[PDB]
Motif scaffolding. Sequence first.
Motif, PDB file in Angstrom:
ATOM      1  N   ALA A 382       1.116  -1.136  -0.225  1.00  0.00           N
ATOM      2  CA  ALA A 382       0.162  -0.419   0.440  1.00  0.00           C
ATOM      3  C   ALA A 382       0.469   1.224  -0.284  1.00  0.00           C
ATOM      4  O   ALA A 382       1.880   1.273   0.807  1.00  0.00           O
ATOM      5  CB  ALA A 382      -0.738  -0.259   1.508  1.00  0.00           C
ATOM      6  N   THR A 384      -0.068   5.029   0.453  1.00  0.00           N
ATOM      7  CA  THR A 384      -1.147   6.047   0.996  1.00  0.00           C
ATOM      8  C   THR A 384      -0.752   7.809   0.423  1.00  0.00           C
ATOM      9  O   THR A 384       0.108   8.581   0.692  1.00  0.00           O
ATOM     10  CB  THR A 384      -1.689   5.944   2.621  1.00  0.00           C
ATOM     11  N   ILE A 484     -13.609   3.651  -0.660  1.00  0.00           N
ATOM     12  CA  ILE A 484     -12.047   3.456  -0.584  1.00  0.00           C
ATOM     13  C   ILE A 484     -11.941   3.929  -1.222  1.00  0.00           C
ATOM     14  O   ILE A 484     -12.000   2.929  -2.626  1.00  0.00           O
ATOM     15  CB  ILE A 484     -11.770   1.625  -0.082  1.00  0.00           C
ATOM     16  N   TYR A 485     -11.029   5.017  -1.981  1.00  0.00           N
ATOM     17  CA  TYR A 485     -10.619   5.568  -2.865  1.00  0.00           C
ATOM     18  C   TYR A 485      -8.913   5.378  -3.055  1.00  0.00           C
ATOM     19  O   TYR A 485      -8.337   4.688  -1.972  1.00  0.00           O
ATOM     20  CB  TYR A 485     -10.902   7.135  -2.661  1.00  0.00           C
ATOM     21  N   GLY A 486      -8.503   4.488  -4.532  1.00  0.00           N
ATOM     22  CA  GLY A 486      -7.190   4.401  -5.594  1.00  0.00           C
ATOM     23  C   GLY A 486      -7.332   3.852  -6.378  1.00  0.00           C
ATOM     24  O   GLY A 486      -8.451   3.256  -6.612  1.00  0.00           O
ATOM     25  N   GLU A 488      -5.530  -0.166  -7.615  1.00  0.00           N
ATOM     26  CA  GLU A 488      -5.307  -1.369  -7.287  1.00  0.00           C
ATOM     27  C   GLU A 488      -4.184  -1.463  -8.675  1.00  0.00           C
ATOM     28  O   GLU A 488      -4.669  -2.133  -9.336  1.00  0.00           O
ATOM     29  CB  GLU A 488      -5.745  -3.029  -6.971  1.00  0.00           C
ATOM     30  N   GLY A 495      -3.407   4.405  -3.004  1.00  0.00           N
ATOM     31  CA  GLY A 495      -4.553   4.967  -2.035  1.00  0.00           C
ATOM     32  C   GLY A 495      -4.852   6.521  -1.531  1.00  0.00           C
ATOM     33  O   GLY A 495      -4.107   7.070  -2.350  1.00  0.00           O
ATOM     34  N   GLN A 497      -6.374   9.476   0.592  1.00  0.00           N
ATOM     35  CA  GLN A 497      -7.161   9.704   1.241  1.00  0.00           C
ATOM     36  C   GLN A 497      -7.976  11.534   1.675  1.00  0.00           C
ATOM     37  O   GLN A 497      -6.318  12.231   2.062  1.00  0.00           O
ATOM     38  CB  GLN A 497      -6.822   9.608   3.109  1.00  0.00           C
ATOM     39  N   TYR A 509     -10.945   3.327   5.229  1.00  0.00           N
ATOM     40  CA  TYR A 509     -10.041   3.323   4.200  1.00  0.00           C
ATOM     41  C   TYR A 509      -8.370   2.559   5.416  1.00  0.00           C
ATOM     42  O   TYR A 509      -7.724   1.626   4.375  1.00  0.00           O
ATOM     43  CB  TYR A 509      -8.880   4.421   3.947  1.00  0.00           C
ATOM     44  N   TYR A 512      -9.909  -1.347   5.035  1.00  0.00           N
ATOM     45  CA  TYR A 512      -9.329  -1.878   3.991  1.00  0.00           C
ATOM     46  C   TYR A 512      -7.510  -2.051   3.443  1.00  0.00           C
ATOM     47  O   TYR A 512      -8.293  -3.854   4.067  1.00  0.00           O
ATOM     48  CB  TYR A 512      -9.427  -0.508   2.917  1.00  0.00           C
ATOM     49  N   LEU A 513      -7.091  -1.751   3.971  1.00  0.00           N
ATOM     50  CA  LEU A 513      -5.804  -1.833   3.840  1.00  0.00           C
ATOM     51  C   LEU A 513      -4.761  -2.874   4.842  1.00  0.00           C
ATOM     52  O   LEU A 513      -4.431  -3.789   4.484  1.00  0.00           O
ATOM     53  CB  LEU A 513      -4.659  -0.895   4.612  1.00  0.00           C
ATOM     54  N   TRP A 517      -7.633  -5.903   1.606  1.00  0.00           N
ATOM     55  CA  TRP A 517      -6.170  -6.035   1.352  1.00  0.00           C
ATOM     56  C   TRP A 517      -5.500  -6.227   1.847  1.00  0.00           C
ATOM     57  O   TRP A 517      -4.366  -6.775   0.537  1.00  0.00           O
ATOM     58  CB  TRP A 517      -6.016  -4.288   0.314  1.00  0.00           C
TER      59      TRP A 517
END
Length: 1207
Positions: A382, A384, A484-486, A488, A495, A497, A509, A512-513, A517
């Motif tokens: 990840a 961020t 959840i914004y981003g 893959e 990601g 925020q 968020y 999720y991580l 994910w």
Amino acid sequence: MFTNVKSTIRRVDPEALNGRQLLKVVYVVLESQYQSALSAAVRNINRTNSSLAIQLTGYLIEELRDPENYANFKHDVSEANLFIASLIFIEDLADKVVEAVTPYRDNLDAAIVFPSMPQVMRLNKMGSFSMADAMLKLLRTLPTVLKYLPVEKAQDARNFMLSFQYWLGGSQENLENFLLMLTDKYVYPDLGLPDMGIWHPLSMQMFENVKDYLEWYNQRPDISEDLKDPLAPCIGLIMQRTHLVTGDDAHYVGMVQELEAMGARVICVFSGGLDFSKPVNEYFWDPLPIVDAVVSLTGFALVGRQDHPRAIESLKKLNRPYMCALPLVFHPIQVALQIAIPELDGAIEPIIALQDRLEAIAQRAMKWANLRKKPKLDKKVAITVFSFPPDTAAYLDVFGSIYEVMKGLQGNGYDVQDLPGSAKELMEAVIHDAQAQYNSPELNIAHRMSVEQYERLTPYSVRLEENWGKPPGHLNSDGQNLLIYGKEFGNVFIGVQPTFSPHHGFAAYYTYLNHIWKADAVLHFGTEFGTIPNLYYYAANNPSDATIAKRRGYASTISYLTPPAENAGLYKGLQELNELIGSYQTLKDSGRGIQIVNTIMDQARICNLDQDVNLPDINAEEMDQGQRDTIVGSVYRKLMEIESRLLPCGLHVIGQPPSAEEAIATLVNIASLDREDEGIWALPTLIAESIGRNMEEIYRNSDKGILADVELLQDITLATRAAVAALVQEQINADGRVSFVSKLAPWVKSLCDSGYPNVNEEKLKPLFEYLEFCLEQVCADNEFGGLLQALEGEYVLPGPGGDPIRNPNVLPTGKNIHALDPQSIPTLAAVQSAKVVVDRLLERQRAENGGNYPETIASVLWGTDNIKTYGESLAQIMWMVGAKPVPDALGRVNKIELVPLEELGRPRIDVVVNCSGVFRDLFINQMNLLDQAVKLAAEADEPLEMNFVRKHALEQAEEMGIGVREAATRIFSNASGSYSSNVNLAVENSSWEDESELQEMYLKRKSFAFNSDNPGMMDQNRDMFERALKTADATFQNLDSSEISLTDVSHYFDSDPTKLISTLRDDGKAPAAYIADTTTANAQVRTLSETVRLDARTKLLNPKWYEGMLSHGYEGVRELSKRLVNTMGWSATAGAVDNWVYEDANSTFIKDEEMCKRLMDLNPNSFRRMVSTLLEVNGRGYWETSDENLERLQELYQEVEDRIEGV
């Protein structure tokens, strides 16, 4: 009896008490072995122990039938301190025991029941401990019990486990220890009672080599084959021998058990010494490391005066994650002095029952170990990103840098899928139509989360609901799901925020991580406040923030270089004037040199330099020779300040270091500082020495506007720029063939060509040796390297954060940057430089106030500048009250004293010190010294007109009805746990009606008084804060750097009390606002106005600066709006912003229809912010401008809202 020895004796008495304390012990037991072993232990204690005697009565279990016996048993228990029983399994007699004991259980100091029937076990009482093959099950259970208990109560359970381990041993000296331990800890507490190796709580013998330990470990029947496997995760712990020798080690035990219950093989090493590198080098190898991760619980440096060079060489060999947890985990000064030390060792920090802390340290160590274990092509990374789209002076091209990191990851066998074509394509993949060409910018939704999934996986969901209500709220919500914004990209997840108790979207968020994910590492950029490793890329020039991350988000802080600084240069009207002035020495040869000075003064007036030089309305012809020269010299030195200011004019991509050419300017200023610790002098000192000239005399004559010395200085500067350019050019076209081009020259040429041919070559020799080394460190590409090391589960080389130019050891970058020992400052050089600055501030404040000293100066203290200057700003405040820091034998500054008035040569100035939250966190020890210094000043038997602290304190003491020392309270911060006045938040959110609101929350939030006489209690004291500020004649801060200047960040303005003071003063007078700059060898003390102008002229309104930033596209616009928003800030706190700054901003960026459309097309979100800011500063009364200019902005804001939001 033929086969087993049995005594006729029940009872053992000491022959002679001899005034010793009498312990009374009563046993009932199955085995005669244990009967005669106890009796032996008692007779041995009785014959030798000089303070204690023991009386022993007891019965084998079956002897409790005779009522003769059972009476005496009952009787003996009445009077007994200690009751012991073991193997009582006759139900009949177990109850007869419980009847006799339970009555006097309240009375017994302790009762110890080893495996008996459960009725008898219930009798167990060892301090806070109770019940709230058979012998090894209970033993192996007791470590699993400790986490659920507080540390006192863990210790009592550990004592019961130690007492059991003794019993099992069964030796006469095992049982003597058992009796003596129970007596020491639970009966008569007020009474006397290997250099290194490996330890495990379950082996009663410590080990002195790895094979003996692993041998024992594999031979254990009570663990998995998983913990025996050499492929198993192995975690090293380090502890002091003391706690083992003492048996105060319950938290050490619970730790080992937690690591084992998670299937970690554990190697606890110890030492009675302070060289923990010895145990590390012996027991964490055999050669290869046998450990995937180290957790130190020493809470010391690895090697103790601490020695970091050795410790670093040691931890780089082992090459594993170094984690440290202070024992305090299990006041406030000792915490800040302690935590600082492991950070210089490269430590990461994995920080009522023990459970939380143990579980935290444990889980985090596993994830660090798991970074080794897990194969490259399964590792999930990840990254961020914060505040995109944009509605610190990082100086980071974020999407530029992410792209390079994704490529670097794919060049090294991580599973990066569908790596886009460019940095812009990457941004396009996360923020769809970021540019708002066709449709609204919107964020690529990487996953929708149902309230079901949110509340189930996020346990603390409810604790946010208080004021953000039922999920999913109105933020990062479609109406049913959290968003959840981003995007893959296989095993990499980029990601976003955009926004931050935090709302459900912010929690969602990180849920999720962590749980969905399932990342193995997360990487943040430092641009705020689970168990997975937390990596930050932080600017090398921001140790203070980096340090807060190490302590607040379990972080490891890898350093990147801020863009290679350029000279700001001249442009437009300022270039024109440099030309007019360049023509003044030629038109004096033409005997014309009068009317030019009239023209010089006029162009100086168009540039608004009339506010920085005193430009009296007097024609040149009506002025003598002397003061015509002095008018030019004045204007020219301020032009040269603008030209020679060294700042970055662009953003950094991680992994893309500066070319040798773009490093020359940086090297020029590196070359311009004397270094006693490198035994070399600044090139400019040598050039001035070659003319028999003191470079300090030149600086001070340049400051006065003596034309001769302004030209001499600019000449010497141009000389220094060329010499260094020659050295860099020689190293370029010697294409890395001759490894050190400075030791074979063209820089003695380009000194002679410049016109300085007597430069001592002995001194010059090593200088250019240093410069060439410095050049190589600047140009190093270790930045991607450091992230790799972290992700492999290796140890990242630690290094100092700070100014590269003032401390080149901040180079090369790619390091886990640290602050410094808070007890190593200030240094004698910082103290001496402090006095010069203070002497200079007082000279300037008298001059603009009839020659009267100010009575009180209000000052801000930042951690950042005191790290970079080894405590100058801090030392300035010491010098104000006439105090010096006193370093001890070991060079630690932990005392302070007053200087006699003789030595100060002026009155003690009173002080109001606004310490940032960050200054508090790192340097509360200095806050302690400052408060001690101020209070000595107030108590001093000195005339009040020579000691303003005492003049004020005496008056305030009488009005407030308190003592002079309590009245002398002047050291202030945020409450414990808080940061900033929140004036930065209000101003970023345009969410404030009038200045009185800003000023109100400042007084609420910043009025927490430090007290050296009660350091733990930092109470609010708003009466004192107001009464002190009330007395302020001037406000004062020290500039961090040219890169972290007044308009680059919002913190300087957030802490600014200037207008606040004009509000509180009965006489309503604004204090004079000054800002010291010690970034170059030429220490200036400017007005806040001068400093805001100098930022405007070099940054926002400088083409070199704005075109440099705009050459990076989207994120370029963001840097522009930043300086304009921070400029608004100064209007609100000081009113220190000239109207022309706003006019020229509007001119450059808005009235230019090209630049305007360009900015909007390049970035709507940041351009919208630029327009808001200009409409706001007008709307509020800080910017006067045409009705036409306001109509344009008002349309442009509508134009760009439409683009961003739709219609």
